[PDB]
Every structure is written in C-alpha cells, then in structure tokens.
Design a protein around this ligand. Structure first.
Ligand code: BSG
Length: 351
C-alpha cells in the first residue's frame, strides 16, 4: 500500500475498533481503481481464527445493492419494467390496495409503508401471499419513503420470476459469476464454512437466521476481496463485458426519488459530491419528491449503503468521479454514524 493509504486507514480504523470493541474487521480501499486490503482481529474469538482477505462476513442490507443490480439487469433484459404493476408478476395479489403499486415503488420503499420486517411467522409462499394481501398502506404509492425489507425483498423475488430461475440462481448466474465474485454466497457452502466469521452480539457468537425474503433483503455473505470487486464494477460499469449487467448497474445508480440531500437508487443511495458526513431510529417516514424522469447515474456522487445483521455491521461507499471507494466489513453491529465518519475520513483524505 502507498504510505498515504496505509496511514489514513490504520489511524482511522484502529481507534474505531477500540472504541466500538469490534472483534474483527476487514477494509478495502479502491484508489485510482486498484484495491488495497487491511484486516484486524478475530473472525472467531473462541477458535482464535483471524480475519483474512478470504473471511466471509454477513453483508446484511448491503445485499440490497446486489438485489437492485439484479433487478436492473432484468429490466435491461426486457424481462420486467419498473413501471409494471406488482400484480403483473403476482396475479394472486388481488387486494385493492395493490392497484397502482408498481415494481418501482417496491424497489425504492415508496409503496406506501410496507413494514421494515417480514414477521417471523411468515414462512411459506402462502404465508407471504397472505402477509402482503392483508397489509394496509398508510399512504398513497409514491408519496413517502419507508426503508423496508418487505419492500425491496418482494421486488427481488418478483424481478426474477420471468427468468424462470430461483433468486439465488439468477443472482449467481447473472451477477456473481459474470463479475468473478466467486466467494460471494446467499447460502454459505460447507466447503467455505472454515472462512465464515461469527457475528458477535452482546458477546455471543451468532449467524443470521433464515427468514422470508432473506436472500433478497439481507442474506448475502462475502469476502473483502469480492466486495472490493463489487465496488470496482459499480465505479466503472462500462468495463463490464455483459451488456445487460453493465446497464443494470447504471440503472441501480439512477436517481428515482429525493428526500432531503439523498437520492434513492435501486439498493444504492446517493448524495451529491462533495458533502460532509453530517449530511450523510427503528422507523423513519419521509416524504419523497419524484425525479421525473430519473436522473442517470451521476459521477459526482457519494454512492453508499450500510448493512447490518444481528452480529455484523457493514458499509460501502464510492465516488465514481474520483475512482475512489471503500468497503468496511465488521463482525459486530456498531453504530452507522461511526461507519460513515470513518469512511468519510478515509475517502476525504484520498480525494
Ligand atoms: B438492513 O441491514 O438495513 C436490514 N436490517 S434488518 O433488521 O432486517 C437485519 C437483520 C436481519 C436478520 C436478523 C436475524 O436473523 O436475527 C437480524 C437483523
């Protein structure tokens, strides 16, 4: 690593780990389009297994970037349109509240107040149908944003329906494989368990538990190397050989809605670059303004996503205009503001 990167990263992350009591962490900085890796601490405290560049972390909601891109790829393929009604892909969804709710609304949390969490009791396909049928919107579609697993999760399941493929199969074949993300999993195979970090919550080792729409909303596990490659792909979509995937990436970074200083993409969220971290709560309802039509991906943006599971905390942010990015993977769920502060400190220094 160039000394500048080594220094800013270590001097920022070391105190972070100490203040937040993070067991293990991996960080990748993409600087002029080249990745640099850093690791600290334990993937498994009990077995004294260190974090390495091959350690798997639960990405939590950073998984939504993959879902948003897979969706974009499906649009590019002509398999779905975001202007399509949800019922086009789920005709059993007959309750009248669903009239006027489009795939766009699902993808961007603007359907009218879909719940943050799918209830635990919701297991089967029939359970899900009943859940969405019984749901009562607080608001008309496209008037407020409420971040929600049950929103983008449904979008993910529906977007792959035309493909004929299972969600995991579509993600594997259309996103992971093309991008050479060969150590990124919705389901961690036994051959890779040796690398799967434990999450820590209240000092107990924990992995994410199965749930409806988990794959779609929060279920991806990945290494720091793969996430660095994910950032590279999103920084420069044009280098991507597969046409629809290149387009899907671009679509995921389009600006569909504005709330305050932030713009909603598919999975990704964006703010105009430059900006201070200050500009960058269980339930937070905000009115949205439609961007009509959506603005194509803006190079001078801070594009980011935070993610958490019970035992993991992740963050990704990049700035296309400066070919610069960062991935922070930790096996403790620590406060978002601390993640954003650290990322900003590192990227600001290098930009
Ligand atoms: B995202 O990281 O913003 C989604 N947040 S969340 O609360 O759904 C994360 C999550 C998912 C599963 C579990 C579990 O199985 O205990 C915990 C937290």
């Amino acid at each position: 690593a160039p000394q500048q990167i080594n220094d800013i990263v270590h001097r920022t992350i070391t105190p972070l780990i100490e203040q937040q009591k993070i067991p293990g962490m991996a960080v990748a900085v993409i600087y002029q389009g080249k990745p640099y890796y850093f690791t600290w601490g334990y993937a498994d405290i009990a077995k004294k297994q260190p974090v390495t560049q091959q350690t798997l972390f639960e990405l939590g909601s950073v998984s939504k970037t993959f879902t948003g891109v897979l969706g974009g790829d499906a649009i590019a393929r002509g398999e779905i349109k975001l202007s399509d009604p949800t019922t086009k892909y789920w005709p059993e969804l007959t309750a009248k509240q669903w009239n006027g709710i489009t795939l766009l609304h699902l993808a961007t949390y603007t359907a009218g107040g879909l719940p943050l969490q799918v209830p635990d009791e919701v297991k089967s396909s029939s359970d899900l149908l009943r859940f969405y049928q019984n749901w009562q919107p607080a608001w008309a579609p496209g008037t407020q944003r409420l971040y929600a697993n049950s929103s983008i999760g449904l979008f993910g399941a529906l977007a792959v329906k035309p493909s004929g493929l299972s969600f995991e199969q579509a993600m594997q074949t259309r996103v992971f494989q093309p991008l050479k993300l060969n150590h990124t999993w919705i389901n961690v195979p036994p051959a890779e368990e040796k690398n799967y970090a434990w999450g820590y919550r209240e000092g107990k080792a924990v992995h994410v538990s199965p749930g409806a729409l988990d794959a779609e909303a929060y279920g991806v596990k990945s290494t720091i190397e793969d996430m660095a490659r994910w950032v590279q792909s999103n920084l420069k979509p044009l280098d991507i050989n597969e046409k629809t995937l290149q387009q899907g990436i671009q679509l995921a970074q389009s600006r569909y809605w504005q709330t305050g200083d932030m713009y909603q993409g598919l999975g990704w969220e964006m703010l105009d670059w430059p900006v201070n971290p200050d500009s960058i709560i269980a339930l937070a309802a905000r009115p949205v303004k439609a961007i009509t039509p959506p603005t194509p991906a803006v190079r001078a943006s801070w594009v980011h996503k935070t993610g958490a599971t019970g035992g993991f905390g992740s963050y990704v942010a990049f700035i296309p205009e400066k070919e610069l990015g960062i991935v922070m993977l930790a096996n403790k769920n620590y406060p978002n503001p601390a993640r954003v502060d650290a990322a900003w400190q590192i990227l600001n220094a290098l930009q």
